[PDB]
Design a binder for this molecule. Structure first.
Ligand code: MYA
Ligand code: 75Q
Length: 392
């Protein structure tokens, strides 16, 4: 694989294209709490909903702060559209920089996320205008490739992964309409099926600490190298994406746990998950779902290349992740079929979701990458080794 075209730096336009009458471009400054609030107000009412209009992602302000001001970030890549008269923010598209490995070619890219148009401005073809503009701003800073995910099918996906959902509070999920009562069954029986232990089992498991950064960095990079498409983590990115900062982050978004071997005291495993709520759009009993999403993880067991041993170790580690997520009062635990996740999803009672997430590269060609599922869209241990990046 390789780039599709080379961008002529001499010909990148210094001025943005025109917008629909009454609207104008605005760079957002997310260090300004008022502007972070504006973006949150947009996403909270206008961002991704399920096909039944029951739920809407509810990224928190703390989450947006974390997701968008990661190492190397630039305000230029936080793009808004405002109404000229009212000044109201009516659209967004955001990028942050990172490096990816694509079949062991390292690439500098932007991750594109939080593309959003106010419902009242939909179906006006503003999307290609948003895309063209953030493209321009990236080209001006020497970035010519992107990676993104979307639930919609667009030309040439690099992979596709299915969503899986592990009930933690089954009753709540039943009450909000997410989890069914299967027919011959009862509330009690579904609660029993989803019952978790009160304590974790992996010896040496503890919360990640700043002192763990270098060793988690090394382990994660070695583990991620097992995937054709992966995120090439820097130390700063380990710090930012995995180590919660309680003194300056009042609403926690990231949880990370390491396994400190009781004998050697070396870190042999780790896992992490993040907090992303969904608004329950119309329900007298509840107005949000508190979801934990599986993020990055790694284990030394992987490198023996013994599949049964890796499956065993993940079964223990990930059940512990469910236990910890429950203790932190999450309702559900979500994962995709990427990484080695097909090894444990079904046996740990993750239910198959309706959702698929498609992965795309901009201005970069490579062969399709396995996404953890077979042609029936079911988890398959022979279709891993492909997607090693998790996007928010
Ligand atoms: C080097 C740097 C490059 C950087 C950029 C790399 C590319 C990044 C690309 C973006 C990565 C975003 C990653 C995320 O954030 S994915 C999250 C997307 N956001 C949401 O789902 C929020 C709820 N929905 C909305 O806000 C709107 O419905 C959106 C804004 C999604 C579409 O608004 P609207 O419904 O009013 O549509 P339109 O009339 O303006 O435009 C119609 C055109 O737009 C194409 N469309 C529809 N949905 C998507 C989508 N999710 N990705 C890319 N394109 C999409 C569509 O096929 C059609 O194309 P075509 O008919 O011309 O073929
Ligand atoms: C708020 C909401 C939306 C959709 C669904 C159903 O399963 C999904 C379905 Cl069908 C789609 C998506 C989805 C759709 C569009 N975009 C995304 N992403 C998430 C990754 N970053 C880009 C945007 C996810 C996510 C899930 Cl979890 C659920 C359970 N909840």
């Amino acid at each position: 694989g390789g780039p599709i075209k080379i961008i002529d730096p001499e010909k990148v336009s210094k001025e943005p294209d025109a917008l629909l009458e009454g609207f104008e471009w605005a760079t957002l400054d997310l260090t300004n709490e008022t502007e972070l609030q504006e973006l949150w107000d947009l996403l909270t009412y206008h961002y991704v909903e399920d096909d039944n209009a029951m739920f809407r992602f509810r990224y928190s302000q703390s989450f947006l702060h974390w997701a968008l001001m990661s190492p190397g970030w630039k305000k230029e890549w936080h793009v808004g559209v405002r109404a000229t008269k009212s000044r109201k923010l009516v659209a967004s598209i955001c990028g942050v920089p990172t490096e990816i490995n694509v079949r062991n070619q390292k690439l500098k890219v932007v991750e594109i996320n939080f593309l959003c148009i106010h419902k009242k401005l939909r179906s006006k073809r503003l999307t290609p205008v948003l895309i063209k503009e953030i493209t321009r701003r990236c080209y001006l800073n020497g970035i010519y490739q992107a990676i993104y995910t979307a639930g919609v099918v667009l030309p040439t996906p690099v992979s596709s992964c299915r969503y899986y959902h592990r009930p933690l509070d089954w009753l709540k999920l039943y009450e909000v309409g997410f989890s069914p009562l299967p027919a011959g069954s009862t509330k009690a029986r579904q609660i029993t099926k989803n019952h978790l232990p009160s304590t974790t089992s992996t010896p040496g498991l503890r919360p990640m600490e700043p002192k763990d950064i270098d060793t988690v960095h090394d382990l994660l990079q070695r583990y991620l190298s097992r995937f054709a498409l992966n995120q090439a983590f820097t130390r700063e990115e380990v710090d930012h994406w995995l180590v919660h900062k309680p003194e300056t982050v009042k609403e926690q978004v990231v949880w990370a746990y390491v396994v400190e071997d009781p004998e050697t005291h070396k870190i042999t495993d780790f896992f992490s998950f993040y907090n992303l709520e969904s608004t329950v759009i119309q329900n007298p009993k509840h107005d949000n779902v508190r979801a934990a999403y599986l993020y990055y993880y790694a284990t030394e067991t992987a490198f023996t290349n013994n599949m049964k041993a890796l499956k065993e170790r993940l079964l223990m580690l990930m059940n512990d992740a469910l236990i910890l997520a429950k203790k932190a009062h999450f309702d559900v635990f979500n994962a995709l079929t990427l990484h080695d996740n097909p090894l444990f999803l079904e046996q740990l009672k993750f239910g198959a979701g309706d959702g698929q997430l498609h992965f795309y590269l901009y201005n970069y060609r490579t062969a399709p990458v396995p996404g953890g599922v077979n042609e029936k869209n079911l988890p398959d241990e022979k279709r891993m080794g492909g997607v090693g990046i998790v996007m928010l």
